Structure 1
Amino acid sequence: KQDMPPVGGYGPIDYKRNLPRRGLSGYSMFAVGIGALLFGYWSMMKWNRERRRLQIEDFEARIALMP
């Protein structure tokens, strides 16, 4: 008279399905995104506009001498 089922009580644990979480949806992206790309170029247009300022300085010595 030793058999399995307990006196009362159990779960259950469900079978259901959910795993949908976001995550900056629905045009929130395309908003930050195009915002970074610009600050990329604004970081250019200055380094590259400074480096030319040195470029001329370098061709200067060449023309300075060479008589």
Structure 2
Amino acid sequence: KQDMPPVGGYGPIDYKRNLPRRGLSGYSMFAVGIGALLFGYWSMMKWNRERRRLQIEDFEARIALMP
């Protein structure tokens, strides 16, 4: 008279299938990308242009000597 099945206490667990979490898609991407990339080239032309100014100063000390 000592046998298994309980009178109660059950679930069940699902048979389902779901993890579609979105996700920042669909014109949200391709907009943060271009907005990041244009910040890069804007951070250029303030350094590459400025280094060309110091470049001419480096040639300047050459030319003020050599006679």
Question: Same-fold call, TM > 0.5?
Answer: yes
Task: Give how far 1:41 is off.
Answer: 0.2
Q: Does 1:59 align with 2:59?
A: yes
Cα offset, 1:42, TM superposition: 0.3
**Alignment of 1:13 onto 2:13:** yes
- Secondary structure of 1:13's counterpart equals coil
Distance 2:63 2:29 in 1: 52
Cα shift at 1:9: 3.0
The 2-side partners of 1:35 and 1:14 are apart by 43
Deviation at 1:22, TM superposition (A): 1.5
**Partners of 1:9 and 1:52 in 2: how far apart?**
78
Q: Percent identity?
A: 100
Structure 2 unaligned runs (5+)? Answer: none
Number of residue pairs aligned between Structure 1 and Structure 2: 67
CA RMSD of aligned residues (A): 0.7
Q: What's the CA shift for 1:3?
A: 0.5
